[PDB]
Amino acid sequence: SMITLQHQDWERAVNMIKNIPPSAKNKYFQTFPFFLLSETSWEELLSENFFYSYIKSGEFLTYQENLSFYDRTIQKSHGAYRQTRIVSPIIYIFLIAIASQVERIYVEKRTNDMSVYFSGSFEKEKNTAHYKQSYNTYMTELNACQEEFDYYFQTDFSTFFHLVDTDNLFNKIDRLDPKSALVYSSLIKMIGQGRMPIVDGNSGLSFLNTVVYLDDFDKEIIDSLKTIVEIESFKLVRYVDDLHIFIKCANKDLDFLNYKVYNLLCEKATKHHLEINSSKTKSFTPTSEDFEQYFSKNTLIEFLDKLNNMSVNADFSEYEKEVLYTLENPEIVSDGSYILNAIVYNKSTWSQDYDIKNKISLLVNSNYRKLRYSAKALITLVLNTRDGDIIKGLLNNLFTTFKNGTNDIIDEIILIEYLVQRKFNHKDLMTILHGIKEYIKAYQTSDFIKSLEKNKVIFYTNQKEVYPLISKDKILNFIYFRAKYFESLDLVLESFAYYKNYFDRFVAHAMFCTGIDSGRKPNYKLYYTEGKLIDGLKQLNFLSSDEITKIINEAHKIRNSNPVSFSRYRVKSSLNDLKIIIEQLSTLLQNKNR
Amino acid sequence: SMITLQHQDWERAVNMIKNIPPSAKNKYFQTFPFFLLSETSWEELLSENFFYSYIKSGEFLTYQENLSFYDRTIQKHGAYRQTRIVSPIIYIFLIAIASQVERIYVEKRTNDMSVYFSGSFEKEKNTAHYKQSYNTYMTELNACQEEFDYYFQTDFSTFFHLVDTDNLFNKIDRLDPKSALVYSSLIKMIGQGRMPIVDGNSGLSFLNTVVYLDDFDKEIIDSLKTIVEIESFKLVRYVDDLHIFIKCANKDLDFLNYKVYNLLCEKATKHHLEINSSKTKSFTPTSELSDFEQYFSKNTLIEFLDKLNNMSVNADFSEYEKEVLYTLENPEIVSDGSYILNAIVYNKSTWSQDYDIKNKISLLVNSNYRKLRYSAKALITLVLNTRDGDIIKGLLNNLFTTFKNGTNDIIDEIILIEYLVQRKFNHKDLMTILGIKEYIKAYQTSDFIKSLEKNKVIFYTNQKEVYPLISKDKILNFIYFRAKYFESLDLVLESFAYYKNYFDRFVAHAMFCTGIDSGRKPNYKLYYTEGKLIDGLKQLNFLSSDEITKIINEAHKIRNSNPVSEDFSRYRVKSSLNDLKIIIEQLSTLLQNKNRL
DNA sequence: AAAAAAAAT
DNA sequence: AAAAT
Ligand SMILES: [Mg+2]
């Protein structure tokens, strides 16, 4: 009733993550907690008992573990900062479940003149939350368009996710229930502190931003391209924000087509609040544009030498020009980054050469900061040496900088990349363990389904019987979620209005628990007035009658002046008073004795 | 008081706009309305009665003229800046918001830094134009050149569109949360949910530069002081543009470039700022910072118009800048042809009247006027500098042909609006040409203060007297403003809940106004429920008695299931809001009828 | 050199 | 298994 999500969507979401090969779940930070999941813990996820009582009831949006998010900076391919947000494993499923419901009820506007792919696939019998299957199919079609058509146009959007209007995204889904779209958009915006976050690899946000949000824009490009008579045929292929425009035309019309198509892209992008990446956009280009023999171990030695002699103050431009180009073989068709990844993932024994392992040791001990140019590949290169003195040396060099206080964001990314590749080893964690450190201790060492059932609160009535009405309340769970949603954005007016409703209803629940109100269902409406609140709270024998009248009278003075239904400090002070009462009214209920 | 804005803040906002020179007022779209304002209209804007009865009461947020915003694309490297055109009253309010913030905000940055924005709040130099601050900014850049050794330039990409308006107003500690709600929601209403770009507005320029960037700017100041290789440093800022002047030894330049640049990238990411990489240059020596007919002549302009006419319209901005704009450059002066072209159209107006020059300009506007899109503002001035009727009217006729044929695109709109602004909205051109055009008719043609009072709704009671309680209702006005704010964002649940509250209070006023309800104040509380609300609408005898029952029944059905107060879709909610809106239109029309019943 | 103004954002 | 946005 509150979330229109069906169990089939949550099931689909859980199945896409489970379908990821176990040898792939533990290569990423965000998918590692699912790698530690037992088979019995999986069965609980797809079980409808866990869905209707914890997911659909909104109970999961009432625990601080599911409303807490963390910052994590990852490295861009060419040396930029991609700021991401880390969410709890439960929230990671919910984002995919939302996309599962949207895929069922959204009617696409783009025609079959264009193929679309994202970091996932809802294709039947091939559901997966990973990018390999979709990206491989994406690159296979780019080759098909490479042979069929003559020229291609490539465009891209800058800061795509951060410029997405989350409210506008959910508004273009007609058959989406507005009461449910309010819950979805609030959670997503809460992850991004008001804007569309970057949950790296999350197919939920990938599908929503590529298939739904870009639908209107892609449709106008398709329709306008048909009016151009100079184009014989065309085909569009898109991966998230990357777009390829293959066409068939005469060479004599290439100039006018470049003028027509580029102005068509700019006009429509500005129309839909999209910013075209001028750097990553090229004009109409012709479609044409033993491994130990192409790249030997000597070519790898020159890489470490040019890198070990390069100063640590060199930017990415100096690293990519000298060091990375050393790997490119004239006869081979690959960049310096692609060849480097092929060595660490296939020629793993090369790091055990006497010369290579020694040149590697010089890198880690001289300055580990040189690892920042390719953190994933270079750390794998270090770990491929299989030498404990080097592996423990890189960790201790990181530990010394974190011990002093000079640890910036570069020391962080190297540390997190190191801890993920070593599978969050217990000995490494005992030496390191703030912010992201809390998520590592919380979900990266245990089964979060087993820890979910242990840390569950339980209320006991006067007859020492379990009270299950609070957690199953589809009104209390969502009013509390909205009160926390506005609190994270520091919007104290709307946050007080919602929490005051949660306060009156939770008080009405503690009455049915102690047997004071002995009706069919709890009397929620009775405690909306001031006279019934301070009288019932005093009847609970858990607070002083002088303080109770001091808090609710002040809180009533705020509700009668709240323009949502007096400084931020005054509102936050009365809200903190309402929270302390709840924390004591809660601890009073779990005590079966008296 | 639903906004804590003071009269001094509004007075300041109107003064800095008035302080703009007239010959600069008539140069921009947003400020041209004020160029037509009579002196009595200026007196009214500063008058105490106008502020308390129209601004601080929220009455201005209940007229469609102040809640209607239109898109407009201005020219950048040949990119698109999507702007949002606001009403003249709204243009002042954003500036008045900045005035209250300037009085109560405490800057965290120190005097190691100099911050400028598009305007000024200086004691004796209040101005809403950018020429004053930009000249002071250019002067400080020259002083910093003569004293420091190297400078580091930085810039933010999509700076305005990446700002979080809610977080911005949250760094203003002394701003009350209730006024911050109105200020934030109105700004987000203009930008359709995000921070907009109102062309040249000092109010948004001040907030995003002085307040939003404060946390980032102080972090750089504190971190630069810890670098022992930096002897001294001074920081200069203009909106998002930033210069880091330092004094140091040449031997530490490599370490300082790596230290300063990475610190910039780290803290910018921390505050959700996207650093522009194309405009960020490393530590460059200060010496590299940027009689007329002796260098540039009429022949230089003849060579410019020649290559422009030989270049095909299919050419892009790079081919224009490299092949055409280069002919204006001189190998003795460091200057882009853009700055040279601006000097010719603005200081050599008579050059466009030369015989040879005027013929190639006519050839430029008769072959394909879409070649003007490369330098829309400058090349239009070049055409208007010819003072030729057949040439200037020829450009208007070609634009009218592409608009009558229905084949006009965004490029033709940019040339058309810039042409209409540069020709000062000529009467003959307006009759030939005519959403953005509606703003032209409503504001760019006459005194908008005089038109404001001639189009004010007047409500008559049953005794044929004026009913003045609706306009002065601070509660009704702001509730209506929130309903139209959520409606603009297409958020049906919040828009219905606020409009229903506005609907209940408006009917309560119509009940007192028509004499059905007696006493001192209208009985607002009695019309909050289904039953009494239907009876009051039946009593007025202006709608079908059955349709009132169906509309209110469905309206209260939606209210009882609204989670912000299933089977309720977006369409169903929007239909009930429309029926509620339709009833108000009939109720309002009936109220401005003196001799009725 | 002046529709003492446009050109920066 | 990693190497994509
Ligand atoms: Mg609300």
Describe the structure.
The structure is a homodimer. By secondary structure, the first copy, chain A, is an alpha+beta fold. Among the domains of chain A are: 136 residues, Alpha-Beta Plaits; 131 residues, no CATH class; 131 residues. Helices cover 55% and strands 7% of the residues of chain A. The first copy, chain A, has 29 helices and nine strands. In chain A, the strands form three sheets. A five-stranded mixed β-sheet of chain A has the order 3-5-6-4-7, with helices on both faces. Chain A has a two-stranded antiparallel sheet with strand order 1-2. In chain A, strand 8 and strand 9 form a beta hairpin. In chain A, helix 15 runs parallel beside helix 18, helix 19 packs across helix 21 and helix 28 packs across helix 29. At the A-B interface, helix 9, helix 10 and helix 13 of A face helix 8, helix 9, helix 12 and helix 27 of B. The complex binds magnesium ion. Magnesium ion binds next to loops of chain B. The structure holds two DNA strands.
Question: Gist?
Answer:
Two copies of one chain form a homodimer. By secondary structure, chain A is of the alpha+beta class. The first copy, chain A, contains 29 helices and nine strands.
